[PDB]
Amino acid sequence: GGLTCASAPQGTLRILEGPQQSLSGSPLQPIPASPPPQIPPGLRPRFCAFG
Amino acid sequence: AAEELSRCFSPGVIEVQEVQGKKVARVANPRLDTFSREIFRNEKLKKVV
Numbered sequence: 001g002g003l004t005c006a007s008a009p010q011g012t013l014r015i016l017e018g019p020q021q022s023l024s025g026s027p028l029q030p031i032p033a034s035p036p037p038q039i040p041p042g043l044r045p046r047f048c049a050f051g
Numbered sequence: 052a053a054e055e056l057s058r059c060f061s062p063g064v065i066e067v068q069e070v071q072g073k074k075v076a077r078v079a080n081p082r083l084d085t086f087s088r089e090i091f092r093n094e095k096l097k098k099v100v
Contacts, residue, residue: 045062049085 052096059090 053076057065063083067076091097 045085047085049061049083051082 052099055093056090056096056100059093059096061085061087 053065053067053074056076057067059065061083063080064078065076066079067074069075090100
């Protein structure tokens, strides 16, 4: 029950949970481009010149 | 160029009818023309009206 002292420890192993692999996909997923505005189909002159 | 000219005016003005194989264009009811000057945007045909 004396509990004598011991020598100096050489190395200290650190145990830790691993990096989060297979979380990010190898291609990227962007928000798609909002489309450029279209001229709508079915546009015709509705105004006739009077008389 | 006659079908191009028929769309630069209001619908009714330039009729495009065939005269011996070619599609010539003539005026027909110039009253309908809204006078929007869209033919003066066209470079080849701002010299034929």
